[PDB]
Amino acid sequence: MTGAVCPGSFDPVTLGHVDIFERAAAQFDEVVVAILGMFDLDERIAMVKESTTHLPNLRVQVGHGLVVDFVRSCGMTAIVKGLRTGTDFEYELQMAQMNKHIAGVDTFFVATAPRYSFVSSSLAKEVAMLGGDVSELLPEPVNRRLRDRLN
Amino acid sequence: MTGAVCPGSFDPVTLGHVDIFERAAAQFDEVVVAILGMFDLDERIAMVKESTTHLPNLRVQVGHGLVVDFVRSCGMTAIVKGLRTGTDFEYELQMAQMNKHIAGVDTFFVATAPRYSFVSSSLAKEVAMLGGDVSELLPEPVNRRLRDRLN
Amino acid sequence: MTGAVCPGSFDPVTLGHVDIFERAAAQFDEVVVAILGMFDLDERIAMVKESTTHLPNLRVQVGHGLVVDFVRSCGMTAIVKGLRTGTDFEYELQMAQMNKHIAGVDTFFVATAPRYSFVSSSLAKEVAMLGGDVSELLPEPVNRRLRDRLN
Amino acid sequence: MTGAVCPGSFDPVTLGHVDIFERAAAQFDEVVVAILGMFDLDERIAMVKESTTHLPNLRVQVGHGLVVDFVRSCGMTAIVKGLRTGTDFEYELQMAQMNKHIAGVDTFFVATAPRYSFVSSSLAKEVAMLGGDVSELLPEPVNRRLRDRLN
Amino acid sequence: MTGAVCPGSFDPVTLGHVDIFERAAAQFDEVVVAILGMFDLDERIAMVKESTTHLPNLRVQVGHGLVVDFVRSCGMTAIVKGLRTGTDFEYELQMAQMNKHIAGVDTFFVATAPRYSFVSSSLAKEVAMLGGDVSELLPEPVNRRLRDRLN
Amino acid sequence: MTGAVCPGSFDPVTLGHVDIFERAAAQFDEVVVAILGMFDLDERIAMVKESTTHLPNLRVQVGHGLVVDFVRSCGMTAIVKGLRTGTDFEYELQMAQMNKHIAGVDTFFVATAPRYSFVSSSLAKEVAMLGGDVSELLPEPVNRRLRDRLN
Ligand SMILES: O=C(O)CCn1ccc2ccccc21
Ligand SMILES: O=C(O)CCn1ccc2ccccc21
Ligand SMILES: O=C(O)CCn1ccc2ccccc21
Ligand SMILES: O=C(O)CCn1ccc2ccccc21
């Protein structure tokens, strides 16, 4: 009866994201990954699903966007977002306060583990295009697809 | 004989802006709102004028842009800018120092009241388009026009 | 079966604190306020208890300190802390990462509401001693005791 | 009829401080330097007075402390504070919001010039004790007194 | 046998950049300025070369981009980058950590001198287009070319 | 003929420190760890020496303090300092600029590896006293001594 929504573009999902999903999943009864580019919708959904098989209380869903509306529709009142190096925290704070104002939804921030604290969807893609090895920072399902869209 | 310029795009003006205008207006002999998109020039001017009728020592003017040139032309030497959650303060500081360097103009920053600290022109528009209620964060003259550009 | 610990000195508890307690209480099955100076232990406990009567799933407890040990003893794995203006977030982040490292405990941060975002136990006391009125920022049970320790 | 108060310990006054005093003095009808340690009260007053002879509309006064009370007594509603490298801006912002809450007083922040942006009373003293030359960062009246309290 | 790479777009090179180049050049055996828009490639190369004649151990080179690959090819293991007001340090830190992860390359940050701390290629161009005088913040070779692309 | 000084209290030295020492040692001809409390001087020296046997070009020395004087005496012109989570970077920047002003010495900052980014001498001691296991974050020579000063 407790629930958190984890919203993002997830293009593609990274290990920093999965770290947060695991932590949300361990603290709330249900977690919903809301997928709000390099990969299309079902590729992103599939990559999230394939990377979260170990989390039975998590589900993935496309969202169309006011995150607070999505949260409110799912019957929840909490958003969970990760923090990593390069997160624009002032903007996240502005959105958190706006979201509480308009829909009464709370946002809980949690720091990603240090080893995954410097990956982001954008940087991983940019580095990947130029032949940098980011495979230790992304799930296998993502590495698999990233390799294909190279050769 | 004292004067401050409050520069911005004001697309649209928010209650965070009007809060700063009121504070400038109470500390300087004259305030000039310099309007430097969703709304066109006179819509923005009209919304600022309609939202500042209670400030007889404030006037609104379109500006074409080096803010310091505008300030210097008006016979003033001070810029007043607000700070809110999500303000890029490092960039504002860079511009403040550049502005002092090139024209000797000082920039005074003042924090918007907490209740209006999370609204910004951009976020208010984006939330408004998606049916979020931001009317408590914007002046009536703006809410009025925002409603029309919806229906 | 879900639970969060809200740790602090609470000397005295403020409305920013109670705001966070309410949000924790609404998202977790049990909340434990861990009280880790101007007021002594039971005064602090009493002020927290008196200010949280509307939260049946919250309890107050003195803690002796590694917060993670307290959390682990209570059968929980989550800490919830508020953020306000003046919070030393880099230090909170350092502690959050250390806490995850040593005991696997997650820390969730949530922003206090804007109206209570500038109060802190320290500043409220310092302002109170000098005759400033901070009563709108503190619970009645605290205002009551603060008045007495004045006259 | 406009006025700003510039509060601080000024132990001792630095060129970063005098830079702000000059900018306040040029934008307001009256400026009051409120002196709220290495030097005693009149040494600090004397050093401020000696360093501001070129500012006829500035006066120096000892203050006993809620700054807002001092401001309100002088008939003003504005505080002006400088920002330099190492300023704890989050704490200054917390105090600015508290000050507006309790007495309706506004606080205007202005960045000190780059050349004086790294001096602070504390660092100048600590460096001076260890024989570092900080004379280009402090007024002559201060350098004069600092030399004596060395030999 | 020690070496640092200083990467950037340098469009155009500023005195903040040359300050960092000088400091790198004084601490490492070789410095390579890697040029990764208003000016084309050889204009940028020429402006860097003309502004660094006093640095015999510095050379300029176009780079095609993973900076770490460029560094590794030159036989070095260090990147040197400047910090100025408005630098997005969190993003630089994210890239520094990613760069160490993928290629084992270290990044050393050094603060530009205060007098050049507020210039950036972008701001200098934008100010220059609008007739602001930024000549004290840019090398003569750049001022010379900037003047021409005006008249 | 190149050299960096790494200054600090090192009470005790941590793996975040040794990470920086290794990176300095790999980029400069000589590194000098300047030791400027829980452990006394030779305990700290011994712990640094024992933790740096793999760095032949590093030496340890007690310093008496203006760091810039120490640097200048050793014949060097560079300070190398690490950044970790909780570092007061604004204060480090203020000192870096002051140090350049008074002695022309440059300060290069480098980010500690993510896995050691949350340890600090202070936090490691405080956690250690309360029975937290920080052994993965400190060198064996330190863990050895920390164990003894427990039993
Ligand atoms: O927009 C996005 O996809 C990023 C938003 N986000 C959500 C969870 C999470 C965890 C770490 C870093 C960023 C995160
Ligand atoms: O570009 C803009 O319009 C914003 C610039 N600005 C000017 C006054 C003010 C008050 C609060 C927040 C931002 C503000
Ligand atoms: O040490 C303390 O008491 C403050 C720690 N803390 C815990 C909850 C909370 C909410 C807002 C601000 C600070 C808070
Ligand atoms: O407490 C203090 O004395 C510092 C407060 N302060 C007041 C004016 C000013 C200018 C630059 C830097 C700090 C300043």
Ligand SMILES: O=C(O)CCn1ccc2ccccc21
């Ligand atoms: O992208 C760029 O060109 C800026 C990157 N950069 C490199 C050296 C340097 C010095 C001061 C400021 C920025 C700097």
Ligand SMILES: O=C(O)CCn1ccc2ccccc21
């Ligand atoms: O005062 C101190 O000992 C810390 C100063 N310091 C020097 C190197 C280093 C590396 C990581 C973190 C802090 C560091």
